[PDB]
Amino acid sequence: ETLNGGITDMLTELANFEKNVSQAIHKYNAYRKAASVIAKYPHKIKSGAEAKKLPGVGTKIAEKIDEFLATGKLRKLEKIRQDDTSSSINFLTRVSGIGPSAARKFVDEGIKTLEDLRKNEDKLNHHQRIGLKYFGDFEKRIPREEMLQMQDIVLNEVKKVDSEYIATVCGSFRRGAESSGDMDVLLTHPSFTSESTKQPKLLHQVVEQLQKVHFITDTLSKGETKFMGVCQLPSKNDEKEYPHRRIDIRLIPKDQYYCGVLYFTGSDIFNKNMRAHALEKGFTINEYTIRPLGVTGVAGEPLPVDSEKDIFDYIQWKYREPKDRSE
DNA sequence: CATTAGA
DNA sequence: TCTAATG
Ligand code: NA
Ligand code: NA
Ligand SMILES: [Zn+2]
Ligand SMILES: [Zn+2]
Ligand SMILES: [Zn+2]
């Protein structure tokens, strides 16, 4: 957790690099399992040779570990770190819509900067266009102060559209959190469930609503069950206009809501742990449902769920209030 | 690990 | 269709 800290971080930086800058999935993959095991390795590593003994750790990684221990640094690491090429890639990827692939490509075109990015909006697609158009706000955190107004607004319109709807703003916001990155709204209607062959409009209605009253500014993407947009609190009585924010709206079939809700509320730690327990308790949890375990190694049979509570009950747990879903 | 764009 | 991107 800190006893092998440096080692693990160098290794991540290392891994990271193969994957984006170059394209060595392998190596990249190589670095992570290694950094994965050494992290667990409950003993302060004094040498490579020692590390080496680990699984995933081969000749190469050890070597690095040696120099890293020996001298407070790593050359290949210092070099990369400097190297404009790699730097440029890491950077471009910052724009919503820019992945490594494209990052790589732009660079080899000579698009190392945001300015360049501008001068070539032609080479960008819409996602990426919008991305650049809000690069700054994109990086900005969401003061919960803001999260509450936003939430407020969403709920009202949903409501007006159809009172049958069921929305939930999940995430960290849901778990107390002082800020959040983007808003995730969980969505399901009663007329939509596991069987009933879709209802696209079910989603499309509100997407339009919200958009109708200027909360929705732009559309990153829009499916029949998932919508990726850009919203924004109305700039009051002028002077303090609000930063553009990432929002994702999702249609879930009524019968698998709370699992989804449970799920989305996280935290990963509550998850895995909420997950580790359901197993002992004779089950299985997932992003959508919860099925009883059967001794033949496994089983199915998606249990009926009416609320976050139900699941707890199921795995006979203690209802943990969202605020305390922190682990 | 799933859903949407895109070319 | 595949391949990229966000989640
Ligand atoms: Na990006
Ligand atoms: Na392939
Ligand atoms: Zn020891
Ligand atoms: Zn989020
Ligand atoms: Zn999100």
Side-chain angles (χ1 to χ4, degrees):
Chain A
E1 286 173 287
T2 225
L3 76 184
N4 285 122
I7 302 203
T8 45
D9 320 321
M10 163 231 217
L11 252 35
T12 41
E13 278 203 4
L14 231 359
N16 261 321
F17 159 93
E18 305 292 335
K19 109 111 163 199
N20 307 144
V21 164
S22 48
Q23 180 187 118
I25 165 66
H26 283 319
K27 287 191 172 171
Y28 153 78
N29 232 143
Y31 284 121
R32 50 149 339 171
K33 97 301 186 202
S36 145
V37 339
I38 102 94
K40 276 195 201 153
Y41 180 84
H43 279 275
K44 218 205 185 44
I45 305 181
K46 265 48 199 281
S47 43
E50 179 176 349
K52 202 188 148 164
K53 293 182 180 307
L54 267 21
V57 335
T59 149
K60 283 153 297 83
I61 288 176
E63 180 141 18
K64 261 138 272 214
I65 305 183
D66 269 345
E67 166 181 358
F68 178 84
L69 272 5
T71 112
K73 269 260 228 150
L74 171 69
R75 168 175 167 188
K76 191 177 186 162
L77 212 63
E78 63 171 18
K79 179 175 167 151
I80 275 164
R81 201 283 100 165
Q82 276 147 209
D83 184 23
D84 90 280
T85 280
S86 139
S87 284
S88 306
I89 279 161
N90 305 118
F91 179 100
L92 259 21
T93 77
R94 277 157 59 188
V95 174
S96 207
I98 281 159
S101 148
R104 296 198 236 148
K105 142 227 162 193
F106 289 123
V107 171
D108 289 73
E109 266 184 336
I111 336 261
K112 309 175 191 203
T113 124
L114 198 136
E115 289 238 48
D116 305 342
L117 264 192
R118 302 181 164 118
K119 332 295 300 154
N120 312 239
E121 218 185 321
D122 69 297
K123 304 208 153 74
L124 307 192
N125 67 260
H126 176 85
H127 179 169
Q128 338 207 91
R129 289 211 191 142
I130 276 251
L132 163 63
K133 167 164 96 197
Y134 301 130
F135 192 95
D137 315 352
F138 285 176
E139 271 168 352
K140 310 234 177 73
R141 291 300 297 177
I142 327 169
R144 182 168 231 270
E145 339 295 311
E146 310 183 352
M147 285 287 268
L148 303 181
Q149 13 183 138
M150 268 172 278
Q151 156 196 271
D152 185 50
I153 312 203
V154 172
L155 284 175
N156 315 320
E157 311 275 335
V158 184
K159 154 143 182 143
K160 42 234 273 289
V161 24
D162 181 10
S163 159
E164 220 84 71
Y165 275 122
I166 295 206
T168 303
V169 185
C170 311
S172 23
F173 161 62
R174 189 129 167 297
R175 315 167 309 203
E178 290 269 331
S179 36
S180 331
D182 35 30
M183 185 183 260
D184 291 87
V185 179
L186 248 6
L187 205 50
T188 186
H189 185 247
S191 86
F192 173 62
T193 160
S194 303
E195 296 93 29
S196 66
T197 215
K198 308 283 187 198
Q199 222 190 356
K201 289 323 179 179
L202 254 188
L203 173 44
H204 296 209
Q205 254 164 214
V206 342
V207 163
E208 178 175 284
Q209 172 55 213
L210 287 67
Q211 209 167 352
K212 175 189 145 191
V213 317
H214 309 289
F215 181 70
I216 310 217
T217 59
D218 338 61
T219 305
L220 267 17
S221 61
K222 183 185 31 193
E224 51 193 336
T225 30
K226 176 147 159 253
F227 156 84
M228 256 156 39
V230 195
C231 58
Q232 196 215 36
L233 297 178
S235 307
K236 305 283 158 177
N237 14 188
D238 263 354
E239 295 259 18
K240 63 275 284 280
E241 144 136 357
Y242 290 87
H244 279 89
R245 288 138 184 345
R246 287 291 303 99
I247 189 188
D248 309 359
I249 300 177
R250 32 229 299 179
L251 215 25
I252 314 304
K254 158 93 194 205
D255 68 311
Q256 35 166 200
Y257 201 59
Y258 321 84
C259 280
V261 170
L262 195 9
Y263 182 67
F264 265 123
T265 303
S267 46
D268 303 344
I269 77 313
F270 178 53
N271 280 180
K272 313 165 154 166
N273 274 98
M274 162 105 89
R275 292 164 165 203
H277 181 87
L279 231 314
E280 286 342 278
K281 298 332 174 103
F283 309 119
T284 198
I285 347 278
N286 78 171
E287 22 296 60
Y288 333 124
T289 66
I290 198 199
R291 323 142 307 157
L293 233 19
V295 93
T296 97
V298 314
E301 274 14 271
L303 281 335
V305 160
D306 260 75
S307 163
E308 280 214 283
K309 167 82 185 156
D310 282 336
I311 310 158
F312 284 102
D313 291 350
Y314 277 13
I315 49 154
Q316 60 215 124
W317 236 16
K318 64 143 149 184
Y319 181 174
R320 345 239 21 241
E321 255 208 340
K323 135 252 245 277
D324 66 57
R325 308 277 199 72
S326 322
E327 94 145 13

Short mmCIF file of all heavy atoms in Angstrom, two decimals, chain A residues 97-98 100-101, chain C residues 4-7:
data_model
loop_
_atom_site.label_atom_id
_atom_site.label_comp_id
_atom_site.label_asym_id
_atom_site.label_seq_id
_atom_site.Cartn_x
_atom_site.Cartn_y
_atom_site.Cartn_z
N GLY A 97 -13.40 12.76 -26.24
CA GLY A 97 -13.47 12.28 -27.59
C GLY A 97 -12.13 11.90 -28.11
O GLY A 97 -12.04 11.22 -29.08
N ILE A 98 -11.07 12.34 -27.47
CA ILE A 98 -9.79 11.95 -27.96
C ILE A 98 -9.22 10.85 -27.17
O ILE A 98 -8.96 10.96 -26.01
CB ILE A 98 -8.77 13.05 -28.15
CG1 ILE A 98 -9.10 13.77 -29.46
CG2 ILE A 98 -7.44 12.34 -28.29
CD1 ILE A 98 -8.54 15.18 -29.61
N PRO A 100 -6.40 7.49 -27.50
CA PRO A 100 -4.99 7.31 -27.85
C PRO A 100 -4.73 7.18 -29.30
O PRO A 100 -3.75 7.74 -29.80
CB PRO A 100 -4.50 6.05 -27.13
CG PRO A 100 -5.54 5.77 -26.04
CD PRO A 100 -6.83 6.49 -26.49
N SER A 101 -5.62 6.43 -29.93
CA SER A 101 -5.51 6.20 -31.33
C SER A 101 -5.48 7.49 -32.09
O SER A 101 -4.58 7.78 -32.85
CB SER A 101 -6.75 5.61 -31.86
OG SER A 101 -6.82 6.13 -33.18
P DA C 4 -8.62 0.73 -33.03
OP1 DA C 4 -7.44 1.15 -33.79
OP2 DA C 4 -8.51 -0.36 -32.01
"O5'" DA C 4 -9.13 2.02 -32.32
"C5'" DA C 4 -9.52 3.04 -33.14
"C4'" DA C 4 -10.63 3.83 -32.46
"O4'" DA C 4 -11.81 3.03 -32.35
"C3'" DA C 4 -10.31 4.35 -31.06
"O3'" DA C 4 -10.05 5.80 -31.12
"C2'" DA C 4 -11.55 3.95 -30.23
"C1'" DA C 4 -12.56 3.60 -31.32
N9 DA C 4 -13.58 2.64 -30.99
C8 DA C 4 -13.14 1.36 -30.77
N7 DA C 4 -14.09 0.50 -30.50
C5 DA C 4 -15.24 1.26 -30.56
C6 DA C 4 -16.58 0.93 -30.37
N6 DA C 4 -16.95 -0.31 -30.08
N1 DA C 4 -17.50 1.92 -30.49
C2 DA C 4 -17.09 3.18 -30.80
N3 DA C 4 -15.84 3.63 -31.01
C4 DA C 4 -14.95 2.60 -30.87
P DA C 5 -9.47 6.69 -29.90
OP1 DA C 5 -9.50 8.09 -30.29
OP2 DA C 5 -8.15 6.13 -29.50
"O5'" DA C 5 -10.63 6.49 -28.81
"C5'" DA C 5 -11.64 7.40 -29.01
"C4'" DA C 5 -12.79 7.36 -28.01
"O4'" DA C 5 -13.58 6.20 -28.17
"C3'" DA C 5 -12.52 7.49 -26.55
"O3'" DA C 5 -12.93 8.75 -26.15
"C2'" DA C 5 -13.38 6.40 -25.93
"C1'" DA C 5 -14.31 5.97 -27.03
N9 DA C 5 -14.43 4.54 -27.04
C8 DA C 5 -13.36 3.63 -27.04
N7 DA C 5 -13.73 2.36 -27.06
C5 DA C 5 -15.12 2.46 -27.09
C6 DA C 5 -16.07 1.49 -27.13
N6 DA C 5 -15.74 0.21 -27.14
N1 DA C 5 -17.36 1.88 -27.15
C2 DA C 5 -17.64 3.18 -27.14
N3 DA C 5 -16.81 4.22 -27.11
C4 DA C 5 -15.56 3.77 -27.08
P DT C 6 -12.30 9.42 -24.84
OP1 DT C 6 -11.60 10.66 -25.21
OP2 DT C 6 -11.56 8.43 -24.07
"O5'" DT C 6 -13.68 9.71 -24.11
"C5'" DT C 6 -14.63 8.66 -24.47
"C4'" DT C 6 -15.95 8.67 -23.73
"O4'" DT C 6 -16.67 7.43 -23.85
"C3'" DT C 6 -15.82 8.84 -22.28
"O3'" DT C 6 -16.97 9.47 -21.92
"C2'" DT C 6 -15.74 7.41 -21.75
"C1'" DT C 6 -16.80 6.76 -22.59
N1 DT C 6 -16.63 5.29 -22.89
C2 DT C 6 -17.31 4.10 -23.16
O2 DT C 6 -18.55 3.95 -23.15
N3 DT C 6 -16.48 3.06 -23.47
C4 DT C 6 -15.11 3.07 -23.53
O4 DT C 6 -14.50 2.02 -23.82
C5 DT C 6 -14.48 4.35 -23.23
C7 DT C 6 -12.99 4.45 -23.26
C6 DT C 6 -15.25 5.40 -22.95
P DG C 7 -16.83 10.33 -20.58
OP1 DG C 7 -17.31 11.73 -20.85
OP2 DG C 7 -15.40 10.17 -20.19
"O5'" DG C 7 -17.85 9.47 -19.55
"C5'" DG C 7 -17.56 8.08 -18.87
"C4'" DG C 7 -18.76 7.08 -18.58
"O4'" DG C 7 -18.92 6.13 -19.70
"C3'" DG C 7 -18.63 6.13 -17.33
"O3'" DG C 7 -19.55 6.44 -16.25
"C2'" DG C 7 -18.94 4.71 -17.85
"C1'" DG C 7 -18.52 4.82 -19.32
N9 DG C 7 -17.05 4.65 -19.48
C8 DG C 7 -15.70 4.96 -19.48
N7 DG C 7 -14.93 3.95 -19.80
C5 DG C 7 -15.83 2.88 -20.02
C6 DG C 7 -15.60 1.50 -20.39
O6 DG C 7 -14.51 0.91 -20.62
N1 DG C 7 -16.81 0.78 -20.50
C2 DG C 7 -18.07 1.30 -20.28
N2 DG C 7 -19.10 0.45 -20.43
N3 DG C 7 -18.31 2.58 -19.93
C4 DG C 7 -17.15 3.31 -19.82
#
